[PDB]
RNA sequence: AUUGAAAGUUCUGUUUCGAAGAAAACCCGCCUCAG
DNA sequence: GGGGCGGGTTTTCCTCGA
């Protein structure tokens, strides 16, 4: 597995929108409690949705598979990831509907032999006999840090007119700025594997020998993640991103890496994981850092500079 | 005795949520409540669905002399249900019915199944 | 016994469900009676079922057992946990029903001896000769603290698009935010030991060889629930978790920990050990404290760091 | 004499179930007449019966008994308080059934030596020569406090659902929260008496002897009814008790408290006892209060903190 | 004066139902168990006429029904409805709300009479489309 | 009380700057209020517009018979004239009102409401006079 | 004793608002945003009062309000202006500092403050002028 | 020591899977604190 | 000597299955 923490800085962003009343368009933003001195309050902060991320992630993978020659479906090639949900998409595509049970398993593979996204993201098709399959990427909303008793995150509305020779023009925007944070996952030990349980099914030869292609361009596409190649509306309002730290942790068994919250949550995550390695019985526990902030790390770590050294390491 | 003319329309409009969501649901909640909250719930939530119904025009007030009658059209079958839908003073004397004794929301529940079932056997 | 209190602090959370109305979907609330200077009030919050905890728990268990070579059911292999209530379930797996009262006891030596998930977690059969085993772990709903007179908790509705090229699409999703906590208890004096009465019958022998195992891999299955790895919804809304206090008591004596509501339980629960211990006349009765908000603990009461360090103590 | 009046407070909580219908799990509840300005309303309450709580400190005093070696059942050794009803009943244990009325008394010393259960729980032996125990025992109902002009409890139905991958699985259960109070009579000075005239028997040398340890297994078995260890459906829906208010008294004259149904109980239950005594020439009375809402208390009243010190203050 | 007051939140209530095409505020009108929740909704019906007035699609005026009664036209969806009588004073809110302060049971009345009068003007409006 | 004569004071000065600027931004601004610093800000700028009206006579304080006289402040706006009965706030009811919604911001959502129903009820009443003119 | 020093700071702006007859100075307070826009103010608006007090346009007097209390005299263009209450001591100038190196929201708090007790005197003014 | 005496309706279960509010837009045209 | 005027948003989708 493959589990990071990052923290980035943003200023006058607005990439996640919601819904508009009059002429105000309006930032996402979600309650949070905190902890302070005094006990537990309960604040209203700017957020950004998953969601996003999962897009963007997955038209990276895309435009990667596309250029490796990788099979993309004819819906996902468009940025349209609808995936296999409805029997519209399956008449486009052309691939019968599963009959009973039995058959679910040759229905998934006819999925996984077509479209990459549909291998990494995972999909779901209901009806007589569903199918299910679990994304092997896993994201979460992006949080600013609720670190100390002051939020460092502000929002605002902007004032734009539209110029016009003969009136007869005028709307507002959301602005804010912030220090986020986000943590995600990635599953590399069973991308190209079925999940449904069932006998051996004809195909699965194609998918053994393309599962190393399958993994490493999903490992590239996390580069488009970690540069800040996401949101809407960047025509106008494009931010200022800058990173500030990153841990990555490559292990055999689960681990989660703790939330880039507190100052100091790289030496703590290193110590949960020799101890995690020494107890669940493992083999392989490896650590990546990188800091632009001077902040503490620890002992015996290996240190980058930017990302692409990261993900040159993840891929060798 | 008005008040079987309340819980007779009452019934009409669970009967009306019933045959437009295909839905037991909310029946089952009205005549298994035993407080005022869940057959308030109830109330707020089929006539949600019958609002839904309204703005879709799958479900219309119309005459069937003459009877008041409501048609419903779901999942391309066709239903009509003989009577009116409450009114809001109905709701208010009702749930003022309720607050006395919750039997009244059982009843109507009774009523509201037996209207459905007898045109979904028809 | 071993018995533990422990609180939480989570935010922009959804890892449980109900049924949801029209586009939107729903997270479980449950009325909760709380006092404060005026009096007593009731209030509508936010909750997490027990179930999940019981399914991860069991889905960890099954992993540990599947990787150290202690046998697994056949529909236990897959997370499927309906156990041996249907007739169904016996024919796949191939154990004969009971005849009468007399063979109930080989019935259940017979399914002992195949699953350890029946053996840990309990199982029922239904018929002429019904058979019950209690689950030998006890956990119970996520409520947050009800310390003072506000509720550390709060819940909001976010809204969601899905893209198209060809419009003809939007859904909300309910995500709260709480302090939570939770306690759970678990008998090892139980655990491969026989619960029906009646005469001994070939196979115990067996039992008695695993018996060591099997506590080794229920003691081992707890890292998981004491890690955050529970509910659904994870692929695009990862929660924030970490860890605020901890207190574990092992005893030979029934105990039950204070909840974790108050700002002081920990010292009160200590204090109750030892005079329950006195009272009860006891012979073992140690206690592990894990604090990380600063709040009294008390006096000769062992410190740890992490839950590791925790497991690693138990098992020993 | 002891008797007790105990205020408690649950949270998400079903411990005894009533009759289910359909597929659906109802909890118990009975009908109270509230008085309002405007008139009466009818409110349907949930309720714990007090057979359950009979059950659990049955269960607790055999725990508790098996570890001195005082005698116990063999039907009661099992979980099954049956106790010597019927001539099934006697034939396995191996007493011989009363000859006539004028034996009667023998019989019932023959039983109270051969079952510790028999003679605190008691038991009724039907047939041509019955014969009666009543219980040193006495419990009641455990209703909410009908205090002020609103009612703290709660009652609701959640939905929950069963996984399988080939559906062809749906229950509910209705979970409460309330603000209970409950009150307890026990004899501690006619255990190990027998309840019928005649001339005394061989074999009443050994109850004289087994009257204090007796004694002292029954004085303990109150600290699991005290702690909260009755009730049902603990695997998955292990409620929160705590105490609020707890008045003891021990005499040598029968008395009992007022209800806790109001907010000053303590107070008129001190000023009663002392009119009591007055007037039926008593020599001990002695109150133990533990308090932890803030009611108001009185004078001549020893505080005491837990329940622990309260079982070694009654033991003593 | 009571009933007087009564029936003028009754007509605000029934306007704004009419105008915004939803029940909801006359629901939580006539549910209403506290001064907070009643006060609530007195602004926000009074929000939602407001913009109706801005829009110039809630005007008051005079109708023949031989003498002239005061009326509100409501224009909602392309649909037109006339409520009969006054809308409230500022007086009337205060009024009002002081009636709320000694007994909720107002505010039930209200909702009652404003359901009845949006009611019998939407059953009238469907007929006329019918025929 | 005390508190509701600030109140409606309070709600006055609302009025008074809603019917003198046609604009119900403030009175939205008010009403909606979750902070003291929202409260704050619009009782400067309410008082900022009612102070443009008082230096161009656009706004002065009269009494007028009801029969005894009651205070009022006269608004003419547009070629409209209102009239709004009562006192416009104090110094001190200014700075009791802020001390109330450090306490509890509801009462920012009081005076919101009361001064919207002051101006509906004079919009209204000076409608219908041109309508019968 | 923060809202004791934050009236004082309100008064010294009121006293230089209605001396100078211009309120760019109390603008500039309230939407101050740094220490250096309030320290400004503070040492303008006092430099301001100054003048007035070497001119003796302004002067601390008491006034009966049946108990005498401290009141600043202000003359402005033969307009006499009396604001009651103290002005800041330096400790007072030095304690509000340290409360806006804080938070400027205390610079908002003494504007508001100091644009009342100015525009309630200008009122009174104006008022006795016309009877 | 009362139609009283003697009794648990208890055991086993995820509402799970998936989906960018996204695209377009100037607050701008006029002013000496002066003798 | 305490400013003026013109603008206060338009579409598209309101859940699918056991």
Same mark, same amino acid.
């Given at each position: 597995?493959?589990?990071?923490?990052?923290?980035?800085?943003?200023?006058?962003?607005?990439?996640?929108?919601?819904?508009?009343?009059?002429?105000?368009?309006? !930032?996402?933003?979600?309650?949070?409690?905190?902890?302070?001195?005094?006990?537990?309050?309960?604040?209203?902060?700017?957020?950004?949705?998953?969601?996003?991320?999962?897009?963007?992630?997955?038209?990276?993978?895309?435009?990667?598979?596309?250029?490796?020659?990788?099979?993309?479906?004819?819906?996902?090639? *468009?940025?349209?990831?609808?995936?296999?949900?409805?029997?519209?998409?399956?008449?486009?595509?052309?691939?019968?509907?599963?009959?009973? +049970?039995?058959?679910?398993?040759?229905?998934?593979?006819?999925?996984?032999?077509?479209?990459?996204?549909?291998?990494?993201?995972?999909?779901?098709?209901?009806?007589?006999?569903?199918?299910?399959?679990?994304?092997?990427?896993?994201?979460?909303?992006?949080?600013?840090?609720?670190?100390?008793?002051?939020?460092?995150?502000?929002?605002?509305?902007?004032? !734009?007119?539209?110029?016009? =020779?003969?009136?007869?023009?005028?709307?507002?925007?959301?602005?804010?700025?912030?220090?986020?944070?986000?943590?995600?996952?990635?599953?590399?030990?069973?991308?190209?594997?079925?999940?449904?349980?069932?006998?051996?099914?004809?195909?699965?030869?194609?998918?053994?020998? *393309?599962?190393?292609?399958?993994?490493?361009?999903?490992?590239?596409?996390?580069?488009?993640?970690?540069?800040?190649?996401?949101?809407?509306?960047?025509?106008?309002?494009?931010?200022?991103?800058?990173?500030?730290?990153?841990?990555?942790?490559?292990?055999?068994?689960?681990?989660?890496?703790?939330?880039? !919250?507190?100052?100091?949550?790289?030496?703590?995550?290193?110590?949960?994981?020799?101890?995690?390695?020494?107890?669940?019985?493992? =083999?392989?526990?490896?650590?990546?850092?990188?800091?632009?902030?001077?902040?503490?790390?620890?002992?015996?770590?290996?240190?980058?500079?930017?990302?692409?050294?990261?993900?040159?390491?993840?891929?060798? | 005795?008005?008040?079987?003319?309340?819980?007779?329309?009452?019934? =009409?409009?669970?009967?009306?949520?019933?045959?437009?969501?295909?839905?037991?649901?909310?029946?089952?909640?009205?005549?298994?409540?035993?407080?005022?909250?869940?057959?308030?719930?109830?109330?707020?939530?089929?006539?949600?669905?019958?609002?839904?119904?309204?703005?879709?025009?799958?479900?219309?007030?119309?005459?069937?002399?003459? +009877?008041?009658?409501?048609?419903?059209?779901?999942?391309?079958?066709?239903?009509?249900?003989?009577?009116?839908?409450?009114?809001?003073?109905?709701?208010?004397?009702?749930?003022?019915?309720?607050?006395?004794?919750?039997?009244?929301?059982?009843?109507?529940?009774?009523?509201?199944?037996?209207?459905? =079932?007898?045109?979904?056997?028809?």
């Amino acid at each position: 597995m493959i589990s990071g923490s990052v923290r980035f800085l943003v200023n006058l962003e607005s990439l996640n929108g919601v819904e508009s009343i009059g002429n105000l368009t309006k !930032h996402r933003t979600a309650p949070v409690v905190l902890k302070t001195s005094t006990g537990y309050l309960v604040r209203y902060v700017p957020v950004i949705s998953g969601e996003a991320l999962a897009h963007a992630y997955q038209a990276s993978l895309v435009d990667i598979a596309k250029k490796e020659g990788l099979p993309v479906g004819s819906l996902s090639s *468009q940025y349209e990831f609808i995936k296999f949900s409805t029997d519209e998409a399956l008449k486009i595509e052309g691939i019968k509907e599963p009959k009973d +049970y039995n058959d679910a398993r040759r229905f998934e593979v006819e999925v996984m032999l077509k479209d990459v996204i549909a291998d990494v993201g995972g999909f779901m098709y209901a009806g007589g006999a569903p199918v299910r399959r679990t994304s092997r990427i896993k994201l979460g909303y992006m949080i600013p840090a609720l670190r100390g008793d002051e939020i460092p995150a502000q929002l605002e509305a902007q004032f !734009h007119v539209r110029f016009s =020779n003969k009136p007869v023009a005028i709307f507002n925007v959301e602005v804010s700025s912030a220090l986020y944070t986000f943590s995600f996952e990635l599953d590399e030990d069973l991308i190209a594997v079925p999940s449904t349980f069932g006998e051996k099914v004809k195909g699965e030869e194609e998918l053994e020998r *393309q599962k190393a292609k399958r993994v490493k361009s999903a490992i590239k596409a996390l580069y488009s993640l970690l540069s800040g190649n996401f949101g809407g509306k960047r025509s106008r309002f494009l931010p200022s991103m800058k990173l500030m730290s990153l841990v990555v942790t490559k292990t055999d068994f689960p681990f989660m890496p703790e939330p880039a !919250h507190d100052d100091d949550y790289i030496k703590t995550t290193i110590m949960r994981l020799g101890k995690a390695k020494g107890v669940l019985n493992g =083999n392989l526990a490896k650590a990546y850092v990188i800091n632009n902030e001077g902040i503490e790390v620890g002992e015996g770590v290996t240190v980058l500079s930017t990302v692409e050294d990261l993900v040159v390491k993840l891929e060798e | 005795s008005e008040k079987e003319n309340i819980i007779g329309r009452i019934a =009409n409009l669970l009967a009306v949520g019933f045959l437009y969501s295909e839905s037991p649901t909310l029946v089952d909640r009205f005549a298994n409540a035993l407080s005022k909250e869940a057959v308030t719930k109830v109330l707020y939530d089929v006539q949600r669905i019958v609002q839904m119904g309204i703005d879709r025009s799958e479900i219309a007030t119309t005459t069937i002399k003459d +009877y008041p009658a409501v048609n419903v059209n779901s999942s391309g079958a066709k239903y009509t249900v003989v009577g009116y839908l409450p009114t809001s003073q109905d709701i208010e004397d009702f749930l003022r019915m309720i607050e006395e004794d919750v039997y009244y929301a059982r009843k109507a529940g009774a009523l509201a199944m037996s209207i459905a =079932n007898r045109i979904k056997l028809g």
